[PDB]
Enzyme design. Structure first.
Site, PDB file in Angstrom:
ATOM      1  N   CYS A 174       0.655  -1.117  -0.053  1.00  0.00           N
ATOM      2  CA  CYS A 174      -0.070   0.012  -0.026  1.00  0.00           C
ATOM      3  C   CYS A 174       0.829   1.241   0.119  1.00  0.00           C
ATOM      4  O   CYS A 174       0.679   1.930  -1.059  1.00  0.00           O
ATOM      5  CB  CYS A 174      -0.857   0.026   1.249  1.00  0.00           C
ATOM      6  N   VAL A 226       3.912  -0.884   3.812  1.00  0.00           N
ATOM      7  CA  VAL A 226       2.598  -1.028   3.911  1.00  0.00           C
ATOM      8  C   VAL A 226       2.116   0.402   4.159  1.00  0.00           C
ATOM      9  O   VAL A 226       2.957   1.588   4.115  1.00  0.00           O
ATOM     10  CB  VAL A 226       2.283  -1.662   5.148  1.00  0.00           C
ATOM     11  N   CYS A 227       0.636   0.544   4.311  1.00  0.00           N
ATOM     12  CA  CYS A 227       0.243   1.926   4.337  1.00  0.00           C
ATOM     13  C   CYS A 227       0.120   2.600   5.687  1.00  0.00           C
ATOM     14  O   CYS A 227      -0.662   1.871   6.570  1.00  0.00           O
ATOM     15  CB  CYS A 227      -1.393   1.966   3.783  1.00  0.00           C
ATOM     16  N   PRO A 228       0.890   3.438   5.974  1.00  0.00           N
ATOM     17  CA  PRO A 228       0.756   4.476   7.283  1.00  0.00           C
ATOM     18  C   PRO A 228      -0.561   5.022   7.563  1.00  0.00           C
ATOM     19  O   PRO A 228      -0.716   5.926   8.617  1.00  0.00           O
ATOM     20  CB  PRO A 228       1.916   5.380   7.095  1.00  0.00           C
ATOM     21  N   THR A 229      -1.443   4.554   6.637  1.00  0.00           N
ATOM     22  CA  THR A 229      -2.889   4.954   6.865  1.00  0.00           C
ATOM     23  C   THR A 229      -3.616   4.858   8.388  1.00  0.00           C
ATOM     24  O   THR A 229      -3.963   5.939   8.784  1.00  0.00           O
ATOM     25  CB  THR A 229      -4.049   4.144   5.818  1.00  0.00           C
TER      26      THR A 229
END
Ligand code: NA
Lengths: 165, 166, 163, 166, 166, 165, 165, 163, 166, 165
Positions: G165, J45-48
């Site tokens: 992502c 990955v996504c730090p979302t």
């Protein structure tokens, strides 16, 4: 061996001429004691052993010797046996009941696989020291007269220590 | 106690009438035995008990009964005592030496604080079962006649089971 | 608890109608058994509980039920008591002596400080499974009638699984 | 081994010239001591070693050195042996009895399988420190002269530290 | 067994006549208590046993006896069940909940593989001493009348110590 | 006591006349052995003890007696000491080095708080049995002649068992 | 925590609209499962949490997801509750009884203090691996939609391993 | 590791310029110390490592640094070696004998199966804290120069906390 | 210590020239390896030590030596740090990550109270035997040139067993 | 589980926009806290998940709620990440480093296998009692709104003890 060791503390119920009493090591202190163990009340074997001791009990009491017959039966059974057997009837010394087996074990005299005490007699002096031990198999009788001789002999040695012969 | 148990295996040297021999549990198999323990050879105490059994030995023998006296002295000491004390000289039975205390401890008859065996007599039947035990403190004697009575009683019961009075 | 557990192996001597016999767990295999424990022979309490059970010994017998009274007295003592008391003389079932106290301890029924069994009854099915337990302190009698009911009930539940 | 360690406390009965006495570690304090162990009184073996030390006893005494022979026989047996074997009769030092084996085991000198002490000599200084140890199997003798040499060497070193040749 | 022993402490929520109460060993004090355990609420077994008790509750309340029925069900369940079965509705005594089995285990009455209590009834005297015990297999009923007979006998005995045989 | 016990297995490096060798219990089997322990090489004490043994080594080898002097020093130090001391130089028997202390401990001869072996000599027969033990404090010398006497005495008893005198 | 671990085997009695059934982990192999733990039946609190799940049984069932609600109440109680409460009646998913507390403990979700399970939900993939854990105290409620979002994510993440992502 | 831990108590005999002395942990208190361990005296490996250190003994001395070479040889052996080798004769620092092997084991530096210390150097600050460790197998020499650098560096970091 | 012992197994992710590789004890086999541990990435300490190594990497790669720097940082961090510090950018050798400390602990090099490795450098020969060890306190630098000198000496010795003193 | 238990004491280094600070449980007493665990910094990955929390820092801070994000990365790495990533830069809440893994383990949220924490969030009330736990695998993400809903519920439930329903 338990020879020359001090008896251990105990507390049992007993049947002594008519009633129930409690006996402890305290009762033995200061006196000479005979602990007469036998397997069981009401068995089929004649109580000759207990009766001979009974015959010499007046003499033993003269010598200041207390007697305590012991078995794993209850004092209740001793009472019933006492008032139902010619021989047992003569007994005027305390009949200790040892259903927990503790007293019997104190004297390391338990037939563990039977829950019954072995045929053993212990002579204990005023200080609580075992001075004579006698154990016999079924059928091999224990002589009261010989017991009396030992007690006299023990009483003498306590009066005349180191008696060279 | 050791009443009605089987004796343990053992191997000791002994003095028997002028010569040295070895005694093991095998020697007692099939016979009636008297193991007579005492504290020590050569002490100031009277060898009354030992001379006593000596007197009844011919009699015990006629009953198929062997006698072994035992102390923690060596067999060498017994040989010396036997050829020195007149009372002891009457002895014709095996005088077992037990310096390691094994035989003595087998019969749970050791005064650990003195390395000496207590005054104790054991009657052992032909199958090696202990039928009578007698132990007494110093100065309280062992009657050899009362012993004999117990031996005969033991033989009678072995021969006639169930004849205990009702 | 001991409910719904299997009785343990045991071997004791007993007195049963004039003679001495041996009883073991193997004699209970295949039958319904009642183990009736009491503290002691020759005491002064009324032997009503053991009399009750004698009265119903025929019922229980017709029902395929064996009765075993148990105390830590010897079988010699039982034989004697069986002659002193008129009540005890009715007893036709086996009187087990337990001086070693092993049978009693198997049932976790020992007053350790007295060396006597407590007043307890156990109903055991033909598979050695304990189906009913009853224990009371001194003075609180046990009714032989309630025991019969429970036994019939147990025999019923074994042959009619459900409810 | 026990070299350079302090002897352990002990209390034994002994035979010394006609009479019985008690010997403890206190008796060795301030003196030089020789503890001479042997297997048994009255055996068929030659009391050579014991007679040997007996001969050098007057000499050891002039060096302020006490001697204690030891075996697991009782003091009573020593009294008997002393009044029977001519070799033994020459003995004037204390003959310690050790029937419990405590003294023998203190010096780690016990043959457990025989209940007898091994042939072993120990030289103990005035502060109770073991300065020399000698143990040998049966038949290998102990030289009393070599012993004396070691005792004098031990005294010399006690008196003159640092004089070991460079 | 548990006979003649004092009950152990406990803290349980219960259901008694509409309201939720809490019970502890404190409430048993000075009183005669009956712990009536059963396996589970809302089963298909006849709720008859609990009914017999309810039917004799007035008679028991007169004798000064408190009754606590116990199941490892929550007191919540007891409530909903008390208003479902017409038999259960008759219950005026406390209905304890023991979802932690702690009370059940104090009485050694847990069927560990089921998480449910066994059919056991205990009679505790004023001092907390268990005086009567009864346990049965699923299916063998408990007679409330025999329970009464014993509660009376217990009390008579509590007041007439050593009631010898008339 | 270790008297009358079998020696234990070992494996050490040693210095024997010029070179380094490995000695194990195997080397002792079938022979008579003398294990001569001493505290330390290069100390200030004269190597009289080791030298006297050296003087009688030809005789000992006649009697079939192998000698192994032992100390916790390394074989390296033995070599340096050997080729630097009059007395030590005479030595033709193996000089075992025991830096791990295992051999020394095998003979329970370690002064643990010093890490040095005590002054002890052990006579071991062909079967590996210790027949004589001698240990002395610093200053109390060990006589080679007396050692030889013991070895002869031991060798005799092995030939003439139960020699009544 | 139990995240990313496989569920321990179990065997419990359950209520599934009318019928009592035996559920085990064998029933969960191959399917996506949801274990909805809760304190107790017949409580005065709001059966909302459970009812809502029913509101989504449609979809969940579509998603090949089964639902096993669990409490340390017996299946007998679940039945009496199911048909005595409106919201509880909507339940078409299996209602497990865990009176021994074993299932609850496999999910380390027991109030040892009360003998009741805590408000916790678990998402288990077809391999028996817990993918999502949710536990809240009394009062903080669980959200059925949020649960479904996760299940969808979980199902998706499975399809395209490691979604960068 | 032993890095950043406190040295343990010890008491050993040593040879130092013609005489025998005792050294203990109490002699290191308040000073910087170097514990230089090697397997054995009189072996055939070149004594270059100990020579190196002697060459710099003045530097280390000006810097308030004490040097202690350690082997499981006795101090008597050290005295002797100090005369055999010309290299060893340069040594002015204390040569510690460790026959009991306790000092060596404190530093967890014992080859147990040989009873010899491994080739390891320890730099210890005035508080007894180990600030630098260096250990090498036979054949891989240790440079006395790199040791000086590390020592100056340690003395610097103790008087300039930060970096 | 750990000297002269064989390294233990291990499985770690690393960062080497842009790509993420995995390393195990397998890769060390037959080769000469250098494990260069340091506490942490992204601190304010001068990244100089790692730089010295990088500066000699070509020379080491020529000698057939593999270098693995190790911190308990994830290999992810090594990546971001390799592109932040201009010094770190020079690194061509593998940068292992040991967030489980398992590799660090295999070498007994973990500062347990910090969760970070100590400043230690290990030299492992082709057989896996640790041949050189160096550990320093925060602040005392490690000379990459001394590291080289020793790697060479190690190899010379590996090929010239028993290099006596000329 | 840790639901309804008090947090164990801790002491970790943190990054809070510019400054490094030391956080302990002492800092959490009195406030409502949120511990947002995650695997690692600088991952692909996504730090979302983390950024979203920042998106609500406004409100959370309003609600008297502090946020402590935690990873087994050092605070040094957090700093380098905060100012090297857009979303990470939005973070005004304290970023804890847990290189020893102790904080993570107090929250029983460690992947002993990897040395990284699992995706888990904890709501702690002013008394230090965990009120809500949420753990998900890689991929299933946490929802910031759902987190806020809980915190509000948690805060409310506290106000009106036992909210009957
Ligand atoms: Na003896």
């Amino acid at each position: 061996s338990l020879i020359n060791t001090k008896i251990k503390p105990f507390k049992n119920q007993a049947f002594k001429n008519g009633e129930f009493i409690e006996v402890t090591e305290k009762d033995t202190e200061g006196r000479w004691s005979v602990f007469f163990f036998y397997p069981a009340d009401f068995t089929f074997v004649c109580p000759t052993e207990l009766g001979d001791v009974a015959d010499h009990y007046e003499e033993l009491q003269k010598l200041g010797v207390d007697v305590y017959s012991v078995s794993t039966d209850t004092h209740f059974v001793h009472k019933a046996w006492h008032s139902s057997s010619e021989t047992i009837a003569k007994i005027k010394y305390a009949m200790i009941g040892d259903p927990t087996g503790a007293l019997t074990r104190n004297f390391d005299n338990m037939r563990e696989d039977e829950g019954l005490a072995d045929r053993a007699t212990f002579v204990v002096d005023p200080q609580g020291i075992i001075q004579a031990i006698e154990v016999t198999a079924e059928g091999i009788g224990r002589d009261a007269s010989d017991l009396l001789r030992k007690i006299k002999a023990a009483q003498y040695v306590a009066a005349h220590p180191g008696e060279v012969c």
